[model samples]
Target: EIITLTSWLLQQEQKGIIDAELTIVLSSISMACKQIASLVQRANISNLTGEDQKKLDVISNEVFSNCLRSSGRTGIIASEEEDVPVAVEESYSGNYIVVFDPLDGSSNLDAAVSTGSIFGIYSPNDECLPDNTLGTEEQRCIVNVCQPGSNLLAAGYCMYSSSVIFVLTIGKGVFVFTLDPLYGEFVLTQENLQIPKSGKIYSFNEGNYKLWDENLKKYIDDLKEPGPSGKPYSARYIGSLVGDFHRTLLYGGIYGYPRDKKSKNGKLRLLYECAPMSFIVEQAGGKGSDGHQRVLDIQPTEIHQRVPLYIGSTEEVEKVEKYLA
Candidate 1:
C-alpha cells in the first residue's frame, strides 16, 4: 500500500460522491499533512533560524511541491505560499479551482505547539472556467469559482500536534480521520461528526476585548452568564484554530477570530482557511460565518482575501448569530 488517507476515501465511499479528481486532492492533502507533521516532530528548536526558521520553511516548500503535482487534477490552484496560481497546462479547461494554505501557523512549528492546514475548493463561474480575465490565472484567482447555491462541495483542515489528524467534507457531511503510523494510513475515527447543537463556551482573545465591537462584547458577556440552569461555563482560547476547533468539535464549544480595525476582514484567508473550513462546519451540523454572514456565501473578489471566522458547536454559534442579528 502506498499509504493513503483511509478515512477520507472511506467517507467518500460511504457518502457516495464519485469525484476521482477530488479524491486525489484529498489524499494529496493528507499526504502533505503527514509530511508537515513529520517535519515538525523532527524539528530541533535549537536549530531555529531567526524565528522564521527551517522547520516551517521546509514544510511549506515541500507542501507546495507535493500539492502542485496532484493539482493538475484541477483547473487551477491558488496557494498561500505561491505568488501565482498553478494551472494544468493542457487540461486547464477544467472549471474547478482550489485555494489553500499549505502550511498554516508555520511560525509555531518549533515550539511546543499546534498548527494546521486549511483549504477552500471552488468551481469556475457558470460551470465554465472563467476564460476572459485579468493578467493571469493567479490574478483572476479571486474570481468566484462557483456562484452561491452551487452546493459548496468540500472543506477541511488537518492539525499537526500530538497526533496527525484530518477533518474534511464531501457535501454530504463532515468526518474526521486519524493517522495510523504503524499502518501508514489514516484510520476512520469520527463519523457523522456533528458539532454539538447548543454549546456553552466561545473561544477568542479576550485580552483584545478592547478592540471588539459592541455586538461581540455583549455576546461574550452573555456567555459569561450562568444559565438559568446555573452551569457557568469556562472559556478556552488556544490561538490555534485547528486545536481550538478540535476540542470544540468533540465537546460543545465555539471559536472566533473576528475582524478588527487592523485586520478589518480578519486574518484568516478565504481560499486557504475560511471558505473551506466554513463548508465543513456547515456540513457537520454546525455553522461557519463572518459574524453576520456565511463564509462561503461571500464572493472571493481577490486571491489573498481574508475574513472573520466564527464557528463550532451549533448552540454557541447560534448565539453569535443572534448577537449579530
Candidate 2:
C-alpha cells in the first residue's frame, strides 16, 4: 500500500489555510521528484552541458515544470536553472506560483553525496498588480513573483540521499516523509516536527575563513571554546546547502553562508533556497536571517536575487545576529 501527502493537506485544510488545490500541486511535485531521483543515478551518462548548470539540473527543472503544468495546478514557475520564467497556457486556471532550485548540490553528485530539490509555493499576489488582469506571461510573471517569503503558502525540500526524505511546511507545521521503494510512494513518518531551541553544533565552510569578516570568524571561534555546558561546539560543513541545512533542521545547530569579499550579496538564491528553508525553519520553532535583516522580511526585487543566510536553532541564530550587529 502507498501513503501520500494528500492526508497531510486534508489535515491542513481543517485549519482553514489550504485546500484541495494545493494537494493537487504537491502530488505533481512528488511525482516529478521520483523521476528526478531516478535521473540522479544516470546523470553521468547524459550529455551534461552548461558550465553554470549540469545536465541533470536542466532535466530536473523540465521534469518539475512538465509535471506541474500537466496537472494545470501551477500558474507559473521560476527555476534557478532557467534564465527566464516559464508560464504554461494551461496553467491560467491554476492558483499557485512555484519557485524551485532543482538538483541542488548537483556539483557534489560526482562524489555521490546527498543532493536535493528546494521549492517554495505562493498564491498569486493580486495586490501587486494595478488590476486583476495582467497582459502577457512575462508581464504577469513580474507582477506576482516579487513577494516576500512571508507570503509563501507552502515550502519544502526533498533530499535524495541514502534514502529519499521529503520535508515540508504548509504554514501549519513541519512534516516529514520517507520514500518507500516497495510502493514507490512517500510514507508520512513524522508530524509536527520541532527543532531544539539550542545545541552545540555549527555548520559552515571554514575554507572561506580568510574571506569571512572578523566578527563572523570570532563568533565561530567562540563556538569552539567551552560553553556554559562545558562542551565545545562541533563543526560540520557539507558544501551543499540543502544537505547542510537538512542536518541543521533535524539537529539543533546554525548554518551560515555569509557575504564574502568576492560576492557581496552572498551565494544562495532568495526566492528558492533561502526563503523556502527559512520558512521551514521558522515553522519548526527556529529562526532565519541575513546578517542585518530577517530573511522573510526582506522584499525581493528580482526573480533570481541572492542573499546571505544564517538559519537554524533560535538561540544560535540570535547569537549570530549579535555578532553581525
Candidate 3:
C-alpha cells in the first residue's frame, strides 16, 4: 500500500521534525484542499465560475478559513482575500499562526485553467499569543502572522487541476502528494525532490517589456539568444503565479515578476504568495530571490506587503541576478 499524507506527517512527527499539533493543522489544510478541489471541478455546473455572482476565490477563501478555524490549532490567520489579519476566537484558538493565499490565480478559473492555494505556518512568539493580552486582538494577530518566511515552520501549496497536487516543506526537503480520487486521500508521490541546476525554459510576462527597466529588458532579450546548444530558451507562461511556479519547481527553469514602472514592488504579496513558495523552492534545492536579495531573508513590515520575485533553479536565478545587477 502507498503511504498517505497523514502517515507521512505522522512519520515526520515521530522523527521530531514536527509536533502533533502541527500534524493536525496540516491535516485540516489537506481536507480544505480536497473540498476546494471538488468545488473547482463542479464550479461550472454550480454557476460558481463567473464574476457575476459569488466568486470561486471568495468561496475558496471562506472554505479554507473555516477549515483552519475548525482545526482549533490555528490562533490567527491572514488571508489574501481578507483585508487584515483575523484573530481566531479565544475558545477555538491554538498556538500556530497561518498566512495564506486562498485560490491563487482564481482569475483563471473562468477559463478552466489551474489555480491553487498557498500557505505558510508560523509558531507565534510569546508577545503575540492570546494569554499575553498586551495589545488589541487584531494587533496581536498581525504580529503573530507578519513573520518573515525564514521563520516559517512549514510551507505548502495545493493545486487544483487535472489532479489535485499538494507540495510541502517543513524546513526539510520538499515532498509531493497527489490526491487519489478512489480513496479520497493524498498519497505520497515524491520525497526530497530536487530541481536541475539549469534548464532552457523561461517563464515571464513579456507583454510588460516596455514597462521594465533597462537591465530587466536586457535580461529577457538575452534569454532568447542562441547558446552553445544552438537553440534559444523556450518561453512558457501560464499567466498564473501558482501554475508558473509549480512548473518551474518541477521542470527546472526561472520564473520572475520584476519591479516594473507600473509597480515598483511587483505584484505578488510577500507574505501569502512569494514567501511560502520561496520557502518550498529553497527546500527543494532551488533558489528564490527578489532580483538582488534572497526572498526568505527579507523582513515583512506589513501583512499585505508586496515584493518582486525571481525564483526557480539555482543556476537560472543566479544568472538573472547577475543581469539585474
TM-score of each: 0.80, 0.85, 0.88
Model 3 ranges with Cα > 4 A deviation: 48-54, 73-94, 109-111, 126-145
User: Which parts of model 2 have CA positions greater than 4 angstroms off?
Assistant: 1-3, 10-17, 44-53, 73-90, 109-111, 126-140, 228-230
**Predicted candidate 3 versus true structure: per-residue lDDT over 1-325, tens digit per residue:** 3999999989989998887778878888898899988887887688843341126666666676678766542343444453323323221344666765667753543225777778888766533434211244654455445576545788899987777899998887999999999999999999998987898889988889999999998889998999888899999988767778888999999998888888889978777788889888988889999999998888877645789999999999999999988
- Which lDDT value does model 3 have at 235? 99
Model 2 lDDT per residue over 180-281, tens place: 888787889888898889978898888888998998889978988886778899999767677788889899999999988876888787766788898999
Model 3 weakest lDDT span, ten residues long: 82-91
- For all candidates in order, the CA lDDT equals 0.65, 0.74, 0.76
Top candidate by TM-score: 3
Error of 2 at 181 (Å): 1.5
Which pairs, if any, clash in model 2?
Answer: none
Q: On residues 1-325, what C-alpha lDDT tens digit does candidate 1 reach at each position?
A: 3324564485566676846666666666677677766766666653465244334644454464556464543244444552233332111435445555555554453234776666656655533333212344535534555433363466778787788888877677777788887876777777788878877777888878888788888888877878789877688877666778777776767888898766788877665567667777778778788888777688777766778888887678777889877
Ranking of all predicted structures according to TM-score, beginning with the best and ending with the worst: 3, 2, 1
